[PDB]
Structures are given as structure tokens and as C-alpha cells.
Amino acid sequence: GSSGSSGTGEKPYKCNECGKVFTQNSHLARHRRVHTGGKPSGPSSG
């Protein structure tokens, strides 16, 4: 039944917001921004 899909995270740096991984820390610290500040798909604006 429930199998433990392997190959999920090969680095100590992982975003605790969405669930992503990075090879470095700077990439993780900067990535976080995508959350606090970001405009994903949505309605039409100007």
C-alpha cells in the first residue's frame, strides 16, 4: 500500500513554507521572499 516515494530532498536546506529544497542557504533565504512578497495567478488588475 502506501509506499515511501524516495528521492524527495537531498539537501539540508528546505523551505518550511511550501516544501521545496535548495543546494545553498542564500537560495532558500531569498526564495522565502516569493511568499511574503509575490503576485501569483489571479484576477485582472492594474
Q: Give the residue carrying C-alpha cell 532558500.
A: 28
Of residues 9 and 17, the one with the C-beta less far from Zn ion: 17
First to last CA, the chain: 49
Nearest one of 1, 17, 19 to 9, comparing CA atoms: 19
Report the C-alpha gap between 26 and 7 in whole angstroms: 23
Binding segment for Zn ion among 8-16, 21-29, 36-44 (CB under 5 A)?
8-16
Q: Is 17 in the site for Zn ion (CB under 5 A)?
A: yes
Of residues 17 and 30, the one with the C-beta less far from Zn ion: 17
Of residues 3 and 16, the one with the C-beta less far from Zn ion: 16
Q: Is 15 in the site for Zn ion (CB under 5 A)?
A: yes
